[PDB]
Amino acid sequence: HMLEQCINPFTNLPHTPRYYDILKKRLQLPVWEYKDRFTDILVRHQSFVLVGETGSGKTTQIPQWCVEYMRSLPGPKRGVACTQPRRVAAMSVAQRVADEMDVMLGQEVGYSIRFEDCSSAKTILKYMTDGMLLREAMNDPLLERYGVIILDEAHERTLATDILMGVLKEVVRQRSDLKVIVMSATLDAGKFQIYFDNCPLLTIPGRTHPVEIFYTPEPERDYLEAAIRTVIQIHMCEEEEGDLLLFLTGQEEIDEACKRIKREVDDKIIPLYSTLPPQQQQRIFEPPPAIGRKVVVSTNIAETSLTIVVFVIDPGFAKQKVYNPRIRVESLLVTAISKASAQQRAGRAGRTRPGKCFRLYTEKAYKTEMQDNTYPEILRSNLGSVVLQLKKLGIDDLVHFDFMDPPAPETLMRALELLNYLAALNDDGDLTELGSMMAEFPLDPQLAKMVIASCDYNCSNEVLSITAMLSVPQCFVRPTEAKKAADEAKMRFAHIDGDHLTLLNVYHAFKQNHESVQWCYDNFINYRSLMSADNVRQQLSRIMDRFNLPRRSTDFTSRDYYINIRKALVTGYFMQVAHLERTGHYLTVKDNQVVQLHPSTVLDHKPEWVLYNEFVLTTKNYIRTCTDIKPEWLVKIAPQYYDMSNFPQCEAKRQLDRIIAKLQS
């Protein structure tokens, strides 16, 4: 027990009237009935699991109680860390908790996402992404900056969360004072309990009303049409005042639906996705306007990360980034959700009062086709970045590393294979100096190697700009009703050698026109993407200075200016190359996937050899962001990958054999 005078312990001044208005509300959250029982466990055990449904108040109240616990301990004031899988969740819940504690966001309460650290020396509670916390562990193996680490939303089983659970399980074997709390919205059969050595479990009862579930009589031919059909049928055939929540897979699918819903009803529509500006994102909370209603067309951001809604439309699909280690292909994919995911979507209708979830699929499709639980992300991800950070952390044995769900051995082979090709690991599996340096860049190992290697090509300034543009959302604005005008504006920045250099042109012209918003409107350029790219580039350049990596440019009047930049791209992306086939098709080297250039490319011709940044897997295979390259550069820059003694004998090797024979003439 510590002396608590009715003042703000961070300013030694009385709290504001808003603090006590918010305090009255959150005292009614179901978690506050269990504060003593939470405290009794926290002060007697190192790790435990806390299960509570969405809206119980774990995310906002539990970290505040752990700050209370830290302030009572003697010694140097350590902080509290609470991880979130989604960067939007970390930012919004940090601003909310900052209001509840009557402090400025970025001061006592802050957030840390990739490329945006909103914290100071006063920060004692920080909501961060799970990826950022793992990043901090490389320079802080035991995470001694924190006394309590809270892994929230553990049921979503993101790759970074799974690795963190494996790292933290090793840290608590070496640090006795650290408290680890794993929080989940489902029980998951006590899996987290058994993993952390049968630790205690605290379950908060849910306060969710009954939810009626409606199944379609037959499967739907088009789930987007069924979603639009269901939205308008709810609007007219329902007399109870209420709001709508529609789950779609991506941004393009959302803006398309919001457009058609507006057109057919005209005869409040609210989008919500991650890259949507926060000005439009906060519109999900504004009041609704014949009953006037609110329809929120969102992604699975609203499945558990936040709460808003009496009627939910569940098409049953989400977009996942999957990795096929057989063909070394990583792509975003639309796939059916799990029965656990479906229950979480339906549970969002029973928040205010009893609601209804309209599942756009049959009951037999729910029971006989949908998996019970969604595959852990670690079983369908490229592990190269995670392996590199673990080796930097000092974990050498990744075979016997205690994963909750171990990845397939072939997926780990591809990760070790990738890092060795980039010279991040030597032939003994040891981290090299180049690999240790690459691990400090918050980028894919391909991008980190590309940036470092470009110094030798005297174009690190230009690769740094391109890297920043590849690290932000789409910079080209392409409205559906104005494709020709948008494409015409994009072609003003087009470089004849492809898309990577076109991104360079956009950044250069953005800077030389002084970050003008009107200039972005004139050229259909996304102003927010470019400001973000500018911020990302500054931070990456600060990492360059720390390692004394020179930032250099080639004479622009020379032909070597663009040739050196394209050579530098090969240093990182030599594994993502396609070869033009006689009849106009492209074949990826080695893996022999049939692909074609994404329609968004600025290339007005088909180069014989193209390097691509992204594999797009729809009805056909598309490669996006493509650059013309010379095949001679492939054999000279990355000979360990273009090993002709081991290269598969397809048509790509036939052309490469001629070049290598000509080199030895």
Binding site: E220, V322, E410, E417
Partner: protein
């Protein structure tokens, strides 16, 4: 397999089966069901 990824995995002590502390991991990568355009869930079965 003479792949460099296999060799580095064998040099970590990998002996054949699944990964993990007890060798209990999956021994083959999983497969994701392909989604044809915007076909509703369950349309493939019929």
């Amino acid at each position: 397999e003479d792949n460099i990824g296999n060799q580095l995995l064998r040099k970590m002590g990998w002996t054949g089966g699944g990964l993990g502390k007890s060798g209990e991991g999956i021994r083959e990568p999983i497969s994701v069901k392909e989604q044809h355009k915007r076909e509703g869930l369950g349309l493939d079965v019929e």
